[PDB]
Write a protein that binds this ligand. Structure first.
Ligand code: HEM
Ligand code: HEM
Ligand SMILES: C[C@]12C=CC(=O)C=C1CC[C@@H]1[C@@H]2C(=O)C[C@@]2(C)[C@H]1CC[C@]2(O)/C(O)=C\O
Ligand SMILES: C[C@]12C=CC(=O)C=C1CC[C@@H]1[C@@H]2C(=O)C[C@@]2(C)[C@H]1CC[C@]2(O)/C(O)=C\O
Ligand SMILES: *[C@@H]1O[C@H](CO)[C@@H](O)[C@H](O)[C@H]1NC(C)=O
Ligand SMILES: *[C@@H]1O[C@H](CO)[C@@H](O)[C@H](O)[C@H]1NC(C)=O
Ligand SMILES: *[C@@H]1O[C@H](CO)[C@@H](O)[C@H](O)[C@H]1NC(C)=O
Ligand SMILES: *[C@@H]1O[C@H](CO)[C@@H](O)[C@H](O)[C@H]1NC(C)=O
Ligand SMILES: *[C@@H]1O[C@H](CO)[C@@H](O)[C@H](O)[C@H]1NC(C)=O
Ligand SMILES: *[C@@H]1O[C@H](CO)[C@@H](O)[C@H](O)[C@H]1NC(C)=O
Ligand SMILES: [Mg+2]
Ligand SMILES: [Mg+2]
Lengths: 240, 240
């Protein structure tokens, strides 16, 4: 049971911390996480992701504790902290620029155009369109960023993020790996749950067993290859 | 106010969780951390390390949050969880065996002999002896472990651990980078604060600024070289 009327969307104020993740930013914009985007713990993320999206603790504990590395605090982050390049934040994002050549934090409409224009002739994004977008975004980074980092780990994270927008913003069973364009576009562009537009929280739990085959299929269709060393080493904290 | 007399050493029972770290095990054995070694958060580690050893939050937050990755819980570990190979736990330990050829968890006297016999003719261990021990322990792993991992990261972690025993178990200013053998031996062999033997908590804070030059000097004197892969990629969670 969750009451979305008790969780209205509100635009972030000037002192509200927001990060590179539309998932967490949207939860904050609805007060499932603190609207100020600060002093956020893994337990808070677990609860917020469950209440807002029906995303389960398996993925949120795993990703959450990696995310905690990005702050200087014992057990919390600000959402903006997650911009730390090379922990989770990576090149060839769907809606942000690469840090070496631009802003790796804020939503960018020109970057988002690739996703927005994907799956022409359908009213949904799906696994094949998501894979094509990942292929095109990586090619863009390889072309324009001489410092691009593209590893097994970044590629897996990227497919996980695509799987997230396909599942959390779904109309039908998230298993199907497709989501209305109208829902996904609001998610990214406004960091809002598209309630007025007809979206409802999944009644099916979204967990690693559900996401895994979607992730693997997106990767397979994306015609991916590693770059350089292919070293999957994360940055372990800020300012090292 | 911290009262060391209210923190007696007690040997762990068979179901009290202990890990590969003598620093955290000793805090547990004195009740600065829970004696059962479970349900331990980074704030708890920060407070325990301050109270017991005068180790500051900078290093304990950084290491603590990496250590949290080893459990399946949102914000706690058991001490035994820290044995997870390739997060922090590494080959060429001072007092444990390499996981591929033995027990990477428990104190082992035969391994410890190298450290115990270091700095002949003196009643202290110091930076040069610590470096010699690291050189010899790595050589042992290269000789006997077909799955040996030796990277910049493991080498740095090893120097950090040597810097910890030299500073936390010091008699004089921890700056000096030397510790009585009688104190360090009790620390490793019994995971006890050597209070009866004359040890007292440092009155000087032990933080990254203090440890950094000690760590770097231990590395430099150890005649360390890359041997293979050199990708400092940590394991991000259990059972992946
Ligand atoms: C709650 C469900 C979640 C959803 C639905 C979600 C969704 C997404 C999506 C779609 C992106 C890609 C943005 C892009 O490429 O432009 C993303 C990026 C990101 N997410 Fe999440 N996320 C969730 C949870 C988390 C958690 C728990 C963390 C914890 C650290 C996190 C950290 C990030 C980071 C750092 C990025 C930036 C990666 C990059 O594009 O460079 N997310 N998220
Ligand atoms: C800050 C939180 C801490 C975490 C998460 C942590 C974790 C660990 C881990 C996982 C190991 C095993 C590495 C290996 O040898 O394979 C280790 C070793 C060690 N730790 Fe800690 N530690 C912490 C704090 C401390 C403190 C405060 C001290 C102070 C005494 C300390 C001293 C040591 C020493 C001397 C070793 C080396 C043991 C050996 O090589 O046999 N640690 N630590
Ligand atoms: C992408 C992800 C999930 C969504 C997100 O926004 C941030 C992250 C960062 C950590 C990722 C995580 C996963 O989805 C699971 C990953 C990708 C993990 C690191 C390795 C991992 O645990 C794995 O090897 C199997 O999935
Ligand atoms: C080993 C350590 C501590 C324990 C742990 O589980 C994880 C790490 C990784 C990063 C280490 C950190 C330190 O303790 C301080 C170090 C070693 C740092 C990298 C360089 C460093 O910041 C330094 O002081 C000298 O270069
Ligand atoms: C909350 O975060 C701020 C930084 O935004 C930090 O100064 C403060 O100590 C944090 N509080 C905790 C311990 O949760
Ligand atoms: C990119 O790599 C070059 C070396 O190839 C380096 O000199 C430069 O500083 C890097 N730039 C960034 C932004 O990391
Ligand atoms: C995605 O939709 C397009 C257009 O409707 C279709 O051609 C394609 O086969 C779909 N892919 C998947 C994986 O369903
Ligand atoms: C673990 O610690 C938390 C926080 O103090 C507490 O609420 C919980 O009940 C504890 N669990 C156990 C098994 O003791
Ligand atoms: C360590 O002690 C030995 C023996 O007393 C001495 O020869 C050596 O120079 C010392 N090294 C340092 C760094 O103090
Ligand atoms: C360890 O090394 C042996 C011998 O080279 C090899 O057969 C085995 O697969 C290795 N195991 C690991 C942990 O990779
Ligand atoms: Mg990015
Ligand atoms: Mg070890």
């Amino acid at each position: 049971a969750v009451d979305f009327s008790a969780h209205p969307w509100k635009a972030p104020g000037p002192n509200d911390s927001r990060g590179p993740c539309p998932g967490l930013n949207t939860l904050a914009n609805h007060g499932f996480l603190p609207r100020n985007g600060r002093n956020i713990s893994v337990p808070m993320i677990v609860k917020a992701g469950f209440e807002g999206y029906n995303v389960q603790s398996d993925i949120l504990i795993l990703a959450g504790k990696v995310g905690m590395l990005t702050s200087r605090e014992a057990d919390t982050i600000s959402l903006e902290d997650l911009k730390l390049h090379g922990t989770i934040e990576h090149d060839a994002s769907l809606s942000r620029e690469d840090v070496a050549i631009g802003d790796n934090l804020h939503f960018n409409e020109a970057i988002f155009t690739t996703l927005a224009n994907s799956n022409p002739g359908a009213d949904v994004y799906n696994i094949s369109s998501a894979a094509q977008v990942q292929h095109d975004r990586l090619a863009d980074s390889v072309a324009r960023n001489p410092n691009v980092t593209n590893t097994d780990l970044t590629a897996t994270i990227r497919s996980s993020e695509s799987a997230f927008y396909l599942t959390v913003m779904s109309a039908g069973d998230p298993l199907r790996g497709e989501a209305p364009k109208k829902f996904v576009n609001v998610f990214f562009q406004e960091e809002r749950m598209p309630i007025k537009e007809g979206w409802k929280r999944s009644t099916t739990p979204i967990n690693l067993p559900l996401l895994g085959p979607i992730i693997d299929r997106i990767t397979e269709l994306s015609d991916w290859k590693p770059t350089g060393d292919n070293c999957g080493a994360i940055v372990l904290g800020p300012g090292l």
